[PDB]
Design a protein around this ligand. Structure first.
Ligand SMILES: *Cc1c(COP(=O)(O)O)cnc(C)c1O
Ligand SMILES: *Cc1c(COP(=O)(O)O)cnc(C)c1O
Lengths: 365, 364
């Protein structure tokens, strides 16, 4: 049996999404910027996708931008916003549990002369709100937080972070890496009061090669990619129409089936939690404040990679750092840590299979 | 019938290409950076794609990088190469007929304090070699030239350009926007001696959302996209595996059938040229030094947009600074439409095009 439990790394495209995408590869393949009939037709569907994404997120179509991935969206926002504040402001705040897309960009901005401060997180991986309040100063133009951690699944208090940041400095902008939200926990930007947000379609059964960016009307931004003038002149290059259409459909389906999908994942996760603890596993993920499909565990007596390799040999796929370290997790636990991440298509039969095979693997070791 | 003559704007994905892509959406959907079996499988196919592209272009697999589009590649190269020369060198040279991906990036680098020089082109759209030799100096760290113009089709003397540039300053790097080459004219980087080149899969029956970048082993480059470490740490973000696999297969097919395709397109283009000239059309495209599929024509006293609009109504798709750089008269420019064929266009479509465009000219 093939058991894919690494959905936080990427997901299989939904059959409904793929079907819609094929139309744009085979029939409506026009360039959305062309003034002719096939061009206007492509542009129509691209705009319909943008509107569908805006509706799901609760924002205006004009605030939705398409990129090649969330990593691009993140580089774009962090780097161009910084660029608009050069000579004026110099302080940026984020957390040490952010994805490398954010961290490596912050590392780059540091080299360029910016001051990046890191708000620590507690042992459950939740940002320390009291330390955040202190770190935010008048020279702070941007705060970048994630809606949920990809490795351990810890959900962050975005609303409190936004409220606390605005009270300490009304002008500070907030960016939310919202990649792990869609289809796992509810996420609307309608009343969230953030300025920028990043999403990746392949994390919610959408295709790879497509990122989604929310940029609040009027906030700072410049092009990371200059050229033909696509995306209101802010991100040039021919738009990945098939991808954009699939991604929008994927987002809509993910949010529409959220309630049922979340209950189901939460249920499969509880079966995994108990079955693994009974085999000697330490649970790293804080179950009460985490994505319902995510479960980071550890068998301290075994290297995570060794466990990962053996599971893969049995047709079971899981994944295997800077996050656990920031959480104060013991090095021995971190060394044997593996991440199990479900999707709406995972079943109880796969969980039973996973528990049975992992027990065998463990007895041989 | 439906006649798509706007292949230089984008093309329909080859059925053979799409068939391969579908496998990566449905079955082999692992993250190529994942350490497990599905990750290894995706990484494997992604590396095969890289090798297939390297083989086609005559370079090493380690010199091939995948992006989201040629525009991203162009931004990546121009912006980060310039970044490495900050406070050292400050002059960049390009032409006025370059695609906006290049011109807009130059406009940005100019605003950032770099000195951008523009080598003029002749009335046929060919870069003036004498002026190039003159403009390149010791402060010139990079020269960006296109292999062929997308609007009028003019093929540029890339070898001469590189040769002239190296003799004047052996340290100057050369980037070639090679987007309009693949599947239209032969293009190998094996003995070309350039440092960077950009390609766009959707211009050769590959998917949209995929760019191919050639970076000579050892030349300057920094990440435009920082993050997880993908593409040798030079371009992060989860790689578009289905697209990469599709783009490589498309490139392989395009080049493998270039000989037959280019002759077929040239035959179709000549029939179009004669038919259009026998209707009063001025031919803006230099037939002697241009892509075999491209034809920029203009009817006196008829706006290109109007002509394009009517052609579209008849199920015929064509498109409407390059002309300004070539010295083309305003009136002729305003009437310009661009016809661009692909290997799948037919003689039947050309006849239909000629018959309907005449009918249209009578109503206008
Ligand atoms: C996957 C992920 C990213 C990066 O997505 P790419 O699609 O690879 O660009 C960024 N942030 C988080 C939280 C992620 O899970
Ligand atoms: C189409 C084109 C580009 C841009 O390609 P995108 O895929 O839209 O990034 C760049 N240069 C030339 C010559 C082109 O024809």
């Amino acid at each position: 049996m093939r058991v894919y439990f690494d959905n936080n790394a990427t997901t299989r495209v939904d059959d409904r999404v793929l079907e819609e995408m094929i139309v744009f590869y085979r029939e409506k393949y026009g360039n959305p910027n062309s003034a002719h009939g096939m061009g206007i037709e492509a542009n129509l569907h691209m705009e319909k996708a943008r509107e569908k994404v805006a509706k799901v997120l609760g924002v205006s179509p004009s605030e939705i931008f398409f990129t090649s991935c969330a990593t691009e969206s993140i580089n774009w926002i962090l780097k161009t916003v910084a660029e608009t504040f050069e000579k004026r402001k110099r302080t940026i705040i984020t957390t040490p549990i952010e994805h490398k897309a954010v961290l490596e960009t912050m590392k780059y901005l540091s080299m360029k002369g910016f001051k990046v401060k890191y708000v620590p997180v507690d042992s459950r991986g939740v940002v320390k709100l009291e330390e955040l309040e202190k770190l935010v100063d008048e020279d702070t133009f941007l705060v970048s937080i994630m809606a949920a951690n990809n490795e351990v699944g810890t959900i962050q208090p975005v609303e409190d972070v936004t409220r606390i940041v605005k009270k300490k400095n009304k002008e500070t902008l907030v960016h939310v890496d919202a990649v792990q939200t869609i289809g796992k926990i509810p996420f609307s930007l309608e009343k969230l009061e953030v300025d920028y947000a990043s999403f990746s379609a392949h994390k919610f059964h959408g295709p790879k090669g497509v990122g989604i960016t929310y940029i609040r009307k009027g906030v700072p931004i410049r092009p990371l990619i200059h050229g033909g003038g696509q995306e209101r002149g802010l991100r040039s290059g021919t738009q990945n129409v098939p991808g954009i259409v699939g991604a929008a459909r994927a987002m809509e389906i993910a949010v529409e089936e959220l309630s049922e999908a979340a209950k189901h994942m939460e249920k499969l996760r509880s079966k995994l939690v108990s079955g693994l603890m009974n085999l000697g596993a330490h649970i790293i993920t804080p179950l009460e404040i985490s994505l319902p499909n995510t479960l980071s565990v550890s068998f301290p007596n075994i290297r995570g990679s060794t466990l990962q390799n053996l599971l893969s040999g049995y047709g079971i796929y899981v994944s295997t750092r800077h996050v656990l370290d920031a959480m104060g997790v013991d090095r021995r636990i971190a060394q044997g840590a593996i991440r199990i991440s479900l999707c709406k298509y995972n079943t109880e039969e796969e969980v039973d299979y996973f528990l049975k095979k992992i027990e065998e693997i463990l007895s041989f070791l």
